[PDB]
Amino acid sequence: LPGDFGPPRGEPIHAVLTSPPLVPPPVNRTYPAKVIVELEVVEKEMQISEGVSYTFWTFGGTVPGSFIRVRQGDTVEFHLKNHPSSKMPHNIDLHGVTGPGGGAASSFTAPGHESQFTFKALNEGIYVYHCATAPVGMHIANGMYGLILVEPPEGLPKVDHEYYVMQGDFYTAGKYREKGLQPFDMEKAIDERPSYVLFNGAEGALTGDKALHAKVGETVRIFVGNGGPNLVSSFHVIGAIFDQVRYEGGTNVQKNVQTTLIPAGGAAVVKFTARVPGSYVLVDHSIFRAFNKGAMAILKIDGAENKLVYSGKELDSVYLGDRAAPNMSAVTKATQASVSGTLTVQDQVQAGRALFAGTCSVCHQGNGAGLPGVFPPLAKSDFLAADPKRAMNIVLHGLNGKIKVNGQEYDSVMPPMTQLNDDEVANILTYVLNSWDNPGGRVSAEDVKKVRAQP
Amino acid sequence: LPGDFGPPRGEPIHAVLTSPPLVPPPVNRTYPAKVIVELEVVEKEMQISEGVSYTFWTFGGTVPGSFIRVRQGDTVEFHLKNHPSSKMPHNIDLHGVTGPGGGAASSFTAPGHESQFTFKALNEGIYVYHCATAPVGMHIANGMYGLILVEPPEGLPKVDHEYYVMQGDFYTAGKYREKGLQPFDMEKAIDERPSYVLFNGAEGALTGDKALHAKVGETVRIFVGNGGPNLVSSFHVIGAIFDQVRYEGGTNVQKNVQTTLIPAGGAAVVKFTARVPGSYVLVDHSIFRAFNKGAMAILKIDGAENKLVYSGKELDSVYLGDRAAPNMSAVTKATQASVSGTLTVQDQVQAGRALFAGTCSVCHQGNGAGLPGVFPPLAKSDFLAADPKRAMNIVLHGLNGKIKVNGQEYDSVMPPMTQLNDDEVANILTYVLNSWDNPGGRVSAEDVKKVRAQP
Amino acid sequence: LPGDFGPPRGEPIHAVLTSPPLVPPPVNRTYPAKVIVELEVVEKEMQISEGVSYTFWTFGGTVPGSFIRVRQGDTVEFHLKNHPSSKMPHNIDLHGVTGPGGGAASSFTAPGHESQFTFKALNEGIYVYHCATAPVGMHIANGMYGLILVEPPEGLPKVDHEYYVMQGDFYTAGKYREKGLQPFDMEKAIDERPSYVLFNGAEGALTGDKALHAKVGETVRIFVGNGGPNLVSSFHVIGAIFDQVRYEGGTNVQKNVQTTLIPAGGAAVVKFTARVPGSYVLVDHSIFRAFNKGAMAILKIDGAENKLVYSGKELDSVYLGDRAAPNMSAVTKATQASVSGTLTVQDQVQAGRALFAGTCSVCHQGNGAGLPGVFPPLAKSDFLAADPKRAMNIVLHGLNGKIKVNGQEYDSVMPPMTQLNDDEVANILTYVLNSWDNPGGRVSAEDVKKVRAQP
Ligand code: HEC
Ligand code: HEC
Ligand code: HEC
Ligand SMILES: [Cu+2]
Ligand SMILES: [Cu+2]
Numbered sequence A, B, C: 001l002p003g004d005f006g007p008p009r010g011e012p013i014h015a016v017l018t019s020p021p022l023v024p025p026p027v028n029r030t031y032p033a034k035v036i037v038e039l040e041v042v043e044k045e046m047q048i049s050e051g052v053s054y055t056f057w058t059f060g061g062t063v064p065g066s067f068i069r070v071r072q073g074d075t076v077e078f079h080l081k082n083h084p085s086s087k088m089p090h091n092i093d094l095h096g097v098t099g100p101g102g103g104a105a106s107s108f109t110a111p112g113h114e115s116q117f118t119f120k121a122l123n124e125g126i127y128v129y130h131c132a133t134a135p136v137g138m139h140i141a142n143g144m145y146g147l148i149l150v151e152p153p154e155g156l157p158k159v160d161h162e163y164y165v166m167q168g169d170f171y172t173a174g175k176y177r178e179k180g181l182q183p184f185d186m187e188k189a190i191d192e193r194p195s196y197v198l199f200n201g202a203e204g205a206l207t208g209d210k211a212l213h214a215k216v217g218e219t220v221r222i223f224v225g226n227g228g229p230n231l232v233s234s235f236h237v238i239g240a241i242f243d244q245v246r247y248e249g250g251t252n253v254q255k256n257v258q259t260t261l262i263p264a265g266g267a268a269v270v271k272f273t274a275r276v277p278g279s280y281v282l283v284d285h286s287i288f289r290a291f292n293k294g295a296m297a298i299l300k301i302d303g304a305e306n307k308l309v310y311s312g313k314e315l316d317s318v319y320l321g322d323r324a325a326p327n328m329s330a331v332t333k334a335t336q337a338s339v340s341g342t343l344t345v346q347d348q349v350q351a352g353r354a355l356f357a358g359t360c361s362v363c364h365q366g367n368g369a370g371l372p373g374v375f376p377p378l379a380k381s382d383f384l385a386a387d388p389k390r391a392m393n394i395v396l397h398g399l400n401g402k403i404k405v406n407g408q409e410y411d412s413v414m415p416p417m418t419q420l421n422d423d424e425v426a427n428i429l430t431y432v433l434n435s436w437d438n439p440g441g442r443v444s445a446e447d448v449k450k451v452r453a454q455p
């Protein structure tokens, strides 16, 4: 058979698995081994977005699952354990396995049990693994996917950094950024209408202070999976080009491309060389996914500028929106305080500050000053202070026509922003009221609910 | 011109067309010929799923249409006939034809008529053909697509088996598995929301006793089309790898890939080598299509196990669900009996048995025993017998919280299964009631309709 | 760095930009230059379809934006100006730029202002540029995308024609062909449900008298972009094959393919050789886009027939529908007349004539004669004249069963055509009434609204 280098030699190796976005070290090995893999399924609530909880089903406690790294020709003894707290049974299908179900039948595992099967890794490449338990779509949509790398016998070329990034589409009963513990929504899933499309299982998993890092000059390899369940990723890097893209274990390698399609359940290895400092955005270039549903990740490059290659500034909230900042933890706090019944004005102000970036500042500015005659000010705005209910209606329904603000005429259009949730509108408005010599006070989510319901 | 090998020589050849999943034999020919192709359009009702009828519009009585096999450089005389029973006019656009419409204008054919045009096959490759009659989307969605192979002059490499598989997306007024003659739904089609996504024009067309077959060691070529009309297939083989994938007549060939995107109206040739016995699943790896809408087909490999490559078991209902069995003909029977007004308890029991596999057995087991403390039993269940209306509500709406069943406490979650149709719920429950020393009786679809309608 | 050929030499060059579907001439240059690009954003209403207006946001007054053509190694000084009449701020992200945001942060530009940044063009290839201003999806969906070509240092191979074609998906509050100024619809956009999918920013932008042109024998290069924001194009040429397809600046080139996937925000260069005369259709082969939402463009080839390659006729309304004609300007006129309150019978007749092609003529014929016993006549139809309200209901709801028309029995099915708008139905019926010795008179959109509303 291809990839057959004999029986395993040396000692049995207990595989070291890593959580995203990190990868285990190169196998660095000239002989085939028996590799023992132990993976445990855990079902648990985590934050899919700030103040938004979801019950994930995970291989190893993360979405995506633990990264597994072996060598072509290895004999893999795969142990799957299903944690006693689990409610569902689970199993695994690994792409790149040669045999029925990729492991599915022999890895079937009830809560509190363990299963094992053995396989030879005949096929070199980067491969998706996922759960394979009826209803399969439900399991994958709850986060049951990861990557396994089968290295070529001589290993991969050395690089300065290796990272692990995995897209997934998610289906919540609530709309995007609607707070609370969100159930899985089977209707949306059957219709291929995700509420969130994410890298590494949460909004902002790889933005701000959780960005990936490298330096000018260094090479970076990214192992990129698409767990689906349903979407095909127009996978793209903003501001750069991939030196190489290779799908699965495929013999073809594409070079110098910026945009590449990754099928549902597909995987690729991309190589990137850092040339100038700043933030490079990994996105699904089906744009509403990247900018309205959470499908963005940051590779942040540090080092000397090169004005002869690029004279411009680092990314900011104009493009990246509220993810230009280090985090939006103020939103989490304000949500937790709402639940507990201890929500203060300052909680709301801090949450609104986080949310105002991009969403409002793109026209009104970060300091609320506007641009005279073009964008009216929110700083010390007579128009705002004059009527706070009207301000709620402007955010929800937009505004057009001639207005006067601080003694100057505006005649333009503010688009409606109806997708904002009640709490986001309330927090943003509360931030504005308490900034820039505005009169203070607060707007509550419940005030916004009433205005939204009014015909 | 390219692919020009002179005028046709020898005798005129009447092309031998085959129905899916089979392919005509290699042309096996060193000279260009005049090839006469006769294809007849037939409009007819067939089963798109068990007890679910659809009026298909077909090239040659099948979906996909008859496979056409010629040699590059051949002069093809194409005859299209539209059966007198047809209500619509039809025509053909063949990909790989050099000329306006791929044949569309000259092949326009009213019911009871015949058309012909001639073309030279300049372009080697595997190509989609489809109907090209306004409204074009309606025709293609009713099943009017197939494949034509233009062999290279020396022919393709010899293999042990050649098969013909074609994906399509379908748009019914009813939901998935909703019984009866289902009309075409233009709204769903415009929205790209298929109710079914199928290989070879029906659920289970290529599963169970209709699987494709080969033996360990043999090579298999599959001609894979995507008729659409709308979907792009993340085409994938579970448990194996494609040695080669080649799109259309393209010069590039990809090797050792498991997952490949096939555009709407695209076609590929995949090669597969059987290495270990068992069932290999062809799927659209946009998962809800493969596991909720019918997009799965089986290549079943027979021969000696090889425990050094793979130690595990054959696929079963955990992964494949109700398609692990040879067929679900009991469902067809129970549906026909409902229509006729002769539905017996045993009809329902047999239909429910077919439907219980995967759908319920994944947690409750095939024998209904459950797993003590984890999954409650349906076998001899006091809880079930205690209240059959409640059992209907559990299937539709799920169940959580503490319960007692046969003197043991359970505290878990059964997800709702609201996508099940009234008859499926009724048949499944009737099967359960009449198995495992349960008290018998029956649930009717109409009982389930009332429970579903209750607020 | 790669693509570094030294500092700019010679004189500064002011880049010549072209509107679609044309391309600037080859740079024809052996040395790196400083190239100055000046692009102005204009927001304006244009016809997205006949009698249907949309407020586009454009780079240079067109959708797609002005084509930019430079050489690898050039130093580009990019000036973006935002026209004083603009309501929104805008910026640019150019694919192929090496640096954060592809230009986004430094090109941020308020109405009435100008920005500039400089970059070196290190990466050869065809690249999308688009606006990058929060909310990014809204800007791109309003038409803010184009192509930039970075030529290899030796330039591209000479061809006879070079054209510029760009797909986009659009989201209107109204349905397809619903008349009036249509607002942008954020809900449809988030859901990836376009109302229109177009080449070059309008239905018929490249059909009829606006087709692209070449002659038998000539080679044609097309620069093909997919601006999205959301859709992946199954990009296909009907009746031909691409000699070459190359994505972005990629080293891989595919040859002899007819169907190719272009990611959202991707771009390709296709080469085509004209072999026989007639109309070749560029489509997104997700069929409902091409035939129900406007995703078709025509390359019309003139020259001698070659009956040995293809014996058939030129494309007509059977396949192309109402776009087989030179234009549908009568529809624009009738819509303008409705708005002004001067709509005459002849306005309606001419608009209905344009709309009847394909939509009705495929079965009833262009002369309304039908086919005796198979398709009943609309020419001098007693059945039509007998009841005009019934005729309205037939178009909206279809017709089946036995009928008699001009003394002959028909027993067939006319499908419903409910997606037709009130004005289209009214105009079509008014055309029929006033043709072929029918009794004349007229149907108004308001008559059709009442019939449509009746239960
Ligand atoms: C894309 C531009 C844009 C965005 C984004 C935007 N605005 Fe505005 N906003 C405007 C314009 C323009 C007006 C004035 C409209 C007119 O002339 O009729 C306006 C008016 C207003 C007003 C009333 C006038 C004033 O200055 O007091 C308020 C309050 C306001 N915006 C708040 C917000 C808030 C809060 C956000 C975000 C949640 C936001 N806007 C987002 C452009 C924008
Ligand atoms: C994924 C797991 C799973 C699937 C699939 C599933 N069940 Fe259950 N089912 C359970 C669990 C767990 C409970 C107990 C819930 C609790 O503890 O509150 C349950 C409870 C029930 C009960 C009530 C308790 C009993 O044992 O009598 C019935 C009846 C039942 N299921 C029938 C079905 C039927 C019929 C199907 C399929 C149509 C099905 N279930 C599918 C997990 C499942
Ligand atoms: C795909 C076929 C097809 C298309 C498209 C179609 N028709 Fe028909 N039409 C028919 C058939 C068949 C009947 C007769 C149905 C029957 O036998 O019950 C019919 C019947 C009618 C009738 C009533 C009988 C008569 O001859 O007067 C009218 C009026 C009519 N069509 C108008 C139209 C108009 C207007 C259009 C387009 C807007 C249209 N049809 C599109 C096939 C078609
Ligand atoms: Cu699972
Ligand atoms: Cu047809």
Ligand SMILES: [Cu+2]
Residues within 6 Å of the ligand: C057, C088, C089, C090, C091, C131, C132, C133, C139, C144
């Ligand atoms: Cu813009």
